[PDB]
């Protein structure tokens, strides 16, 4: 049984705050073939190496992917402190991880472009006292608490989204603001890989 990466190659990759997760156990993978379909602009890892991530056996392999503009490379890093890692997407600090920035070649036709890149520039809660603010920093392997009030793609840079919470949900307010980056001629993407060592049935082919 081969690990099935093909959902990645068909359709429009979501924006970073809606990153799509594929999880793999008990299967065989070929990461070097998958990456051969893209033009890889950056490939950096933490507690592992690009050579190792393609060659080892794991008890679990998780691959996150999304549209992402190369111009925001500095905001997609295990060292970053900007809106992406604070509010949109954050990897595990304990398991080995890699981050890959890539471009869809004209070769690759089954991946479709959204109208622009979008990200959450801030998600925050105002508590029921109407005076205490709690910025909603995203947890590793989780989505922002604002994904339900932010559209699939932000229409205009600076749009606001606001939701009053019922008392059963804590009361107060949940507010997000969205930012956009103009689409590029070729779609640019981000990939996040997280591996775990356990019984290690995720092995290279």
């Amino acid at each position, epitope marked *: 049984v081969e690990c099935d990466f093909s959902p990645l190659l068909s359709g429009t990759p979501p924006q970073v705050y809606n990153f799509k997760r594929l999880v793999f156990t008990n299967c065989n993978y070929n990461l070097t073939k998958l990456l051969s379909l893209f033009s890889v602009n950056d490939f950096t890892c933490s507690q592992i190496s690009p050579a190792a991530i393609a060659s080892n056996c794991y008890s679990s392999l998780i691959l996150d992917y999304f549209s992402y503009p190369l111009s925001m490379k500095s905001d997609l890093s295990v060292s970053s402190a900007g809106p992406i890692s604070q509010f949109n997407y954050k990897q595990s600090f304990s398991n080995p991880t890699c981050l890959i920035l890539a471009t869809v070649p004209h070769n690759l036709t089954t991946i479709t472009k959204p109208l622009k890149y979008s990200y959450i520039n801030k998600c925050s809660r105002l508590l029921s006292d109407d005076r205490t*603010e709690v*910025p909603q920093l995203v947890n590793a392997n989780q989505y922002s608490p604002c994904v339900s009030i932010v559209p699939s793609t932000v229409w205009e840079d600076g749009d*606001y989204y606001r939701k009053q919470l019922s008392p059963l949900e804590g009361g107060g*307010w949940l507010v997000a603001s969205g930012s956009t980056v103009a689409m590029t001629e070729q779609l640019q993407m981000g990939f996040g890989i997280t591996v775990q060592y356990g019984t290690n049935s995720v092995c290279p082919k």
Partner: antibody
Amino acid sequence: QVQLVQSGAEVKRPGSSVKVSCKTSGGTFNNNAINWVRQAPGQGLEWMGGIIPFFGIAKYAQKFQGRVTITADESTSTAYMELSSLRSEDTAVYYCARDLPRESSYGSYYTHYYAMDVWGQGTTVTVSS
Amino acid sequence: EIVLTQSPATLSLSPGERATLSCGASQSVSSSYLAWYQQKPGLAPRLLIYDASSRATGIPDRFSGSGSGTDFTLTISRLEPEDFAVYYCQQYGSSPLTFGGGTKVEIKR
């Protein structure tokens, strides 16, 4: 360099309403809450309420609840206080003042309606027949 | 409401002397959320001290604040001529924000 500039003096009859504006310049809103504080002749200072720009949600002292509306327009960087059913005892100088800005809680939470480091010049409102 | 009581109502002192201003709260002021302001006739208040003991930007060293719970103090170590004015304490530990009634520091002659 940040300045708060309020609209000019007002004279109002009892029962009417007044709307005072407060424009921030020399800097961003930067999610500093705007407070409204008034001072009647010869008296001390009274907090009426404020608004937090990021949320667009205002908070009011209970003694003014139902009577005051505080709003904010990010596109013009202007906040507004509207006080209704005016009485002669509402005659006062009305100040807008900004919370002291602090490092972002992204601490782990952030308290709005604080010590106030930048104040408007004040707007005199006289309520009389 | 947290009631803030300032004392004395009037301090009468000479340039160069030490001024000690007190503010008492009717209940505990959470997180030491207490500020001090100066106000001169016709002008808006000016923040001196916040969080009980931190000096605001640009405020000279002769101003300091201390205290916690329900007792707070503003001290001016050596008065300059421009320090004669009214001083207000303000708490923001609880809603609504409240101010003390003020202490006037006037020139004794």
